[PDB]
């Protein structure tokens, strides 16, 4: 499908790299995509994510469970048609009402349906996909918090109204926002997974490229869909190996050392960051088409996983070449 | 999912061993963790669940009974798949209704099928695991009390409205909250046998160790605890020093113990009753000039303080003369 | 034809678009679709003024006399309309300009106007970058593949209607 890999580009690598890594492991965290919205972030997301194997799931099912046996009682979807559908991407609007985000339970509907009274909130209809947050900065703190953990753990908690409504929510939180607004809640910023480094200059050509792929996709004459599909699968293949190596470490007396050294030297210490960096870096090799371990992997992910917090410096390369 | 290394957590020459003790036996008492928010109390609790071997239990089942033969009547287990799954740890947020805590019960659903009308509450999904508490200080009395006894006994008693609803709830209760609000309910200290905190080393020592085991993250369960094993002695000493003088100060057959026992041994929930008894008894003792509020005085005021909120039917004398 | 119910009925009428002179760079599509862009010449001098009073007061019944004296003026009015048509196809050349832009939307599964405005703007912006003084149909269709799609039921057609 119309995806824009690393075939030819010198700039927006961070964007792709981050969104791909999170697609592998959700434990990384929400991708804090810096930069303005004019860059057409959502546009890129609604193309890049197409590489992922079109998920198998019930037709109009919000959570889109594969088999009917995994459909939550409230989601009594009559059309139990298990079909193939592309990666769902929902653009989280700025200033969205928290209740509308997760869902609610109407009183009238409740007394006449019970659990069936649950409203299909945004996240409820964004499972197994991507959630593009416009701006994490100019937004309610509690909204960011909720979204961050939901994406982390994996449950769209709707314990409100009068029932403990809940259901899985495994999705990639694309937390977009401006470069910086004013040290807004560093605690939440740390919780984020990777972030597109703003300090590094980028090309402009990617703009036209993305726009063209946006056009040549919707109602594509069976051209761009096929062409890229093989590559889509190739990447997916490596993604499997990444997860296989996720709970393992090929070279202990290497990855652990270099990783910790970088974090400490840059002063960007923090269990949350460190342990995540060590994982993302290893999984990174999948996108590179390599084994797993590699110093430069740690270095690259460092200038992403650390970037979204204080105590960071360009010393990355200078610390450990 | 990626978890933080429980052993390697920054210091914590208290919380760690405390949680381990309760893992052997929950009867020891609830784990009361002092300290501020930065201590990361919840982190430790959940981190332990990671190292704890996946408990054997049915797939689609809240209480997660090992064998299908132990499934509660009211329950409706579909997937009777006995498999392995991580230790269940649920956080109890402040403000949650008692309904969602123990279990919900709809009236319309009741008349339809009272048996399958009882919805499994949060505690049901915490059986054979750990239940974390929010700000126990500000949390409702009836909530804290209920949680305490349930963890103590082992059964989530919901014998109300005639329906003798019940189900296993063998879990470890971890009481959280700020250091101290202002002369809070003493009963907490009594029932929370493991009143520890979270020692946070400012100096190096552990700091370096954390980074190393977080980055590389070794797989050897042995090496995961080896270096930390010695510290258990220090922690043990802390606990010993407390027990060494507890019975001396809070002498049995008097003090908080008996006060709480009286309420629990009678037809009533708890806590709120105990607080009333303690206050009145202390006030009376002051007039009597009795420095030590003996059981006699506790029972004396109980005949009034409890009666107007407790189903009196003798017992008191038979339990505590 | 909405909500499944294919409701329909004759509506053979003449549409008279009114409004103030100009608000500020309004939707150009109006000028295209409104083939008869005229006004209301208001004579300050006498001439008609006297005629009005006379035919308003007495108000004759003869349909012929009602138009007779006014028949000659149709020539002048006609000239006005002719002068426009004389150069319209020259400026707004067919197979390009507003015509095709509006046609694309109407020839597809969507209502209109709001779509056309989106197409025109994007196409013009692109043309500026291309340096193409005249926004050719090719560019119009190019942007249409995105501008319309997210608000129009795309099912080919475009090429078959306007290559």
Q: What is the pairing mode between strands A163-165 and A158-160? A: antiparallel
* CA–CA dist B159, B179 (Å, integer): 35
Decide: A176 and A299 in contact? Cβ < 8 Å. Answer: no
Q: Where are the beta strands (DSSP E) in chain A?
A: 31-33, 56-58, 82-84, 89-92, 130-133, 158-160, 163-165, 172-176
Please indicate if the annotation marks A41 as binding a ligand: yes
Q: Which of C106, C117, C118 is nearest to C28 (CA)?
A: C117
Question: In which element (H, E) is residue A45 found?
Answer: helix A41-48
Decide: B41 and B198 in contact? Cβ < 8 Å. Answer: yes
* CA–CA dist A27, A279 (Å, integer): 9
HSE, side-chain direction, 13 A CA sphere, residue A170: 12
* CA–CA dist B64, B170 (Å, integer): 11
Q: Give A111's contacts in chain B (Cβ within 8 Å).
A: 108
* Cα-based torsion angle of the residue sequence B138, B141, B142, B143 in order, rounded to the nearest 10 degrees: 30
Query: What are the start-end ranges of the H helices in C71-157?
Result: 73-91, 97-106, 114-130, 137-147
**DSSP letter (8 states) at residue A256:** H
Q: Which of A239, A236, A225, A253 is nearest to A292 (CA)?
A: A239
* CA–CA dist A297, A259 (Å, integer): 10
* CA–CA dist A307, A312 (Å, integer): 7
**DSSP letter (8 states) at residue A251:** -
**Chain A interface, best mutation among C126, C146, C148, by max A CB count within 10 A:** C146
Contacts of C99 (CB under 8 A, 6+ apart): C32, C92
Partners of A130 in beta bridges: A89, A172
Decide: A158 and A165 in contact? Cβ < 8 Å. Answer: yes
Maximum C-alpha span of chain B: 65
Decide: B79 and A69 in contact? Cβ < 8 Å. Answer: yes
Q: Is B31 helix (H, G, I), strand (E, B) or coil?
A: strand
* CA–CA dist A281, A259 (Å, integer): 9
Q: Which of C38, C30, C34 is nearest to C15 (CA)?
A: C34
Interface residue B219 vs chain A (CB under 8 A) = yes
Annotated active-site positions of A, please?
272
Q: Which chain A residue has its CA at the smallest distance from C149's CA?
A: A218
* CA–CA dist C60, C72 (Å, integer): 19
Q: Is B175 helix (H, G, I), strand (E, B) or coil?
A: strand
CB atoms within 10 A of CB A187: 10
Domains along the sequence of chain A with CATH: 1-199 (3.40.50.300), 244-321 (1.10.8.80)
Q: Is B176 helix (H, G, I), strand (E, B) or coil?
A: strand
Q: How far away is chain C from the Cα of A219, in angstroms, using its nearest Cα? A: 7
Chain-centre distance of CA A243, in angstroms? 16
Give resolution, Å, one decimal. 7.5
Query: C-alpha distances in angstroms, B313 versus B159, B219, B309, B318, C117?
Result: 18, 58, 13, 11, 83
Q: Which residues of A18-51 are buried (b: 16+ CB within 10 A; e: fewer)?
A: bbbbbbbbbbbbbbbbbbeeebbbbbbbbbbbbb
Subunits with 3+ Cβ pairs within 8 Å of C are A
Contacts of C108 (CB under 8 A, 6+ apart): C148, C152, C153, C154, C155, C157, C158
Interface residue A215 vs chain C (CB under 8 A) = yes
Interface residue A27 vs chain B (CB under 8 A) = yes
Q: What is the pairing mode between strands B31-33 and A89-92? A: unpaired
Decide: B148 and B107 in contact? Cβ < 8 Å. Answer: no
Q: Inter-chain contact A218–C146, Cβ cutoff 8 Å? A: yes
HSE, side-chain direction, 13 A CA sphere, residue A272: 17
Query: C-alpha distances in angstroms, A23 versus A19, A27, A125, C14?
Result: 6, 10, 18, 58
* CA–CA dist C146, A213 (Å, integer): 10
Q: Which of B248, B99, B267, B92 is nearest to B176 (CA)?
A: B92
Q: Inter-chain contact B216–A259, Cβ cutoff 8 Å? A: yes
Decide: A199 and A315 in contact? Cβ < 8 Å. Answer: no
Contacts of B152 (CB under 8 A, 6+ apart): B26, B27, B29, B30, B191
Decide: C102 and C33 in contact? Cβ < 8 Å. Answer: yes
DSSP string spanning A72-111?
Answer: -TT---S---EEE----EEEE-TT--HHHHH--B-HHHHT
CB atoms within 10 A of CB A277: 28
* Cα-based torsion angle of the residue sequence B45, B51, B57, B59 in order, rounded to the nearest 10 degrees: 80
Q: Which chain A residue has its CA at the smallest distance from C157's CA?
A: A219
Maximum C-alpha span of chain C: 65
Question: In which element (H, E) is residue B237 found?
Answer: helix B231-249
Q: Give A209's contacts in chain C (Cβ within 8 Å).
A: none
* CA–CA dist A39, A41 (Å, integer): 6
Q: How far away is chain C from the Cα of A223, in angstroms, using its nearest Cα? A: 14
Angle between helix A295-305 and A13-24 (nearest 10): 100
Partners of B58 in beta bridges: B82
Chain-centre distance of CA A94, in angstroms? 18
Interface residue A107 vs chain C (CB under 8 A) = no
Chain-centre distance of CA A253, in angstroms? 30
Chains A, B: CB contacts within 8 A come to: 77
Decide: B155 and B138 in contact? Cβ < 8 Å. Answer: no
Q: What is the pairing mode between strands B89-92 and A130-133? A: unpaired
């Amino acid at each position: 499908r119309p995806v824009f890999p690393f075939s030819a580009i010198v700039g927006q690598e961070d964007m792709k790299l981050a969104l791909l890594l999170t697609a592998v492991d959700p434990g990384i965290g929400g991708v804090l995509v810096f930069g303005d919205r004019g860059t057409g972030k959502s546009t890129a997301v609604r193309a890049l994510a197409a590489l992922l194997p079109e998920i198998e799931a019930v037709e109009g099912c919000p959570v889109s469970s594969p088999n009917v046996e995994m459909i939550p009682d409230w989601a009594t979807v009559l059309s139990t048609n298990v079909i193939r559908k592309p990666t769902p991407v929902v653009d989280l609007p700025l200033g969205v009402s928290e209740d509308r985000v997760v869902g609610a339970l109407d009183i009238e509907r409740a007394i006449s349906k019970g659990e069936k009274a649950f409203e299909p909130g945004l996240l409820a209809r964004a499972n197994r996909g991507y959630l593009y947050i416009d701006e994490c900065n100019l937004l309610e703190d509690h909204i960011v918090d909720l979204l961050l953990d939901v994406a982390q753990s994996g449950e769209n908690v709707v314990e409100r109204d009068g029932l403990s409504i809940r259901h899985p929510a495994r999705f990639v939180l694309v937390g977009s926002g401006n470069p910086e607004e004013g040290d807004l809640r560093p605690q939440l910023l740390d919780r984020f997974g990777l972030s597109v480094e703003v300090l590094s200059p980028r090309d402009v050509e990617t703009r036209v490229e993305v726009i063209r792929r946006r056009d040549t996709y919707d109602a594509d004459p069976k051209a761009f869909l096929e062409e890229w599909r093989p590559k889509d699968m190739d990447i997916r293949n490596q993604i499997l190996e990444a997860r296989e190596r996720l709970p393992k470490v090929e070279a202990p007396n290497t990855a652990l050392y270099d990783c910790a050294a970088l974090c400490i030297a840059l002063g960007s210490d923090g269990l949350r960051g460190e342990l995540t960096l060590l994982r993302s870096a290893r999984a990174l090799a999948a996108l590179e088409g390599a084994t797993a371990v590699g110093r430069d992997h740690l270095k690259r992910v460092a200038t992403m996983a650390l970037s979204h917090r204080l105590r960071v410096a360009r010393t990355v390369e200078e610390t450990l070449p």
